[PDB]
Chains A and B, each alone.
Chain A
Amino acid sequence: TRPANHRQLTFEEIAKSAKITVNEVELLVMKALSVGLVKGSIDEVDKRVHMTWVQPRVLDLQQIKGMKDRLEFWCTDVKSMEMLVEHQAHDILT
């Protein structure tokens, strides 16, 4: 659910999520990582769990549409930037 930008999680956040004392939140994520559902790391001083990656998950039609929105934004970025470089190098191109 958390997007990539701030996909960091916290022990108390997991506790408000699946019921478990903050003592064993680390153990839960421990088993999760070991089985390989996800990848990342922990910072027990900040009690913040960094999550680089999770297993691919089923998605719904509205999630499909959201992904399409992100893809469209991406493609516009690429097109704009390609056009920029092409323009500013037009004289130096073949």
Chain B
Amino acid sequence: AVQKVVVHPLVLLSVVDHFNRIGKVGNQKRVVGVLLGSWQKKVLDVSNSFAVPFDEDDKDDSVWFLDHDYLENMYGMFKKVNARERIVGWYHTGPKLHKNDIAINELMKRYCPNSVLVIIDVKPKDLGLPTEAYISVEEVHDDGTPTSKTFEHVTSEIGAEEAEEVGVEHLLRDIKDTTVGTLSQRITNQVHGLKGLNSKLLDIRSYLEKVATGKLPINHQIIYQLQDVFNLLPDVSLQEFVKAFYLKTNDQMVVVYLASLIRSVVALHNLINNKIANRDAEKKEGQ
């Protein structure tokens, strides 16, 4: 159970560039490649990658040409180039997951006992990261149908040690927007988080509407989860929560008030100093 996975900027940009290749080459709408990283502890570090000639037909969905021979050739080839790199997963440039994915993941697991799939969204977004991490786990459907091979989500994020940081932030600085303004940045974080939550609930509402209209079958599990969420919603007008809220907000405002005093006093000191210095200077020019 690989709880945590960290992708790296190099693999991200490489996937982007390869997808751009394929876009120029033809119209495939999705692309696949292999992901190399050192599975340090139960936390994977997907730290390099390379594409694999892949294809499929829009209709059958059982047709594709993932080249395992090519795969092995260059897995060994990159092993030769560097040693601490033995396959850990595979990436695909699919805006959404596909059925093909389970079979492809089994194929890759043939090489990696615990392989990790990742979806990289070359198409942009504004809510979360451009990556998603999935693992082919099998769970028993407590009721009804037998167990099936289904993908499962794992905590995926992004990092770089120092060198990738230098390169990425350099290119950013070249073409970017304002850096961390502390207050500004973290308020922007608040608003961005609100936007993401809103988009997610838009999505869940849309699905619920589809089900209510009957465009898809009722999934008692998804229901269970939804009413769990609602059951988990809190109560604010509890008359204890509110008293505590006011009390601690009072403490927060007290500290902010004193800090404001600090700011005001220092600014006033600065004003006194500047005024007296300027007066003495102009007196000098007078004499």
Contacts and interface: CB of A to CB of B under 8 A. Distances in A.
Interface of A: 4-5, 53-54, 56-59, 61, 64-65, 67-68, 70-72, 74-75, 78-79, 81-82, 85-86, 89, 92-94
A59 B226 CA distance: 11
Contact of A78 (B194, B208, B220): B194
B74 interface: no
A68 B201 contact: no
B286 interface: no
The binding surface of chain B is classed by DSSP as helix
A81 B197 CA distance: 12
Contacts of A5: 235
23 contacts: A4-B231, A4-B233, A4-B235, A57-B224, A58-B220, A68-B212, A72-B205, A75-B198, A75-B201, A75-B202, A78-B194, A78-B201, A82-B195, A85-B187, A86-B191, A92-B183, A92-B184, A93-B187, A93-B188, A93-B191, A94-B177, A94-B181, A94-B188
Contacts of B204: 71
Contacts of A72: 205
Contacts, number: 75
Nearest to A60: B218
B51 to A, nearest CB: 35
A61 B220 CA distance: 12
B212 A92 contact: no
A71 B226 CA distance: 10
A74 B201 CA distance: 9
A56 B232 CA distance: 11
A87 B212 CA distance: 35
A54 B178 CA distance: 48
Interface in B162-192: 177-178, 181, 183-185, 187-188, 190-191
| 5 residue pairs, one from A and one from B, having the closest CB atoms | A56-B224, A82-B194, A94-B178, A75-B201, A78-B198
B230 interface: yes
Nearest to B226: A67
Given A65-B212, A68-B212, A72-B205, 4 more contacts: A67-B226, A81-B194, A85-B187, A93-B191
Contacts of A82: 191, 194-195, 198
B199 to A, nearest CB: 10
Contact of A53 (B188, B212, B223, B232): B232
Contacts of B224: 56-57
Contact of B205 (A58, A71, A85): A71
Contact of A56 (B195, B198, B223): B223
A65 B210 CA distance: 11
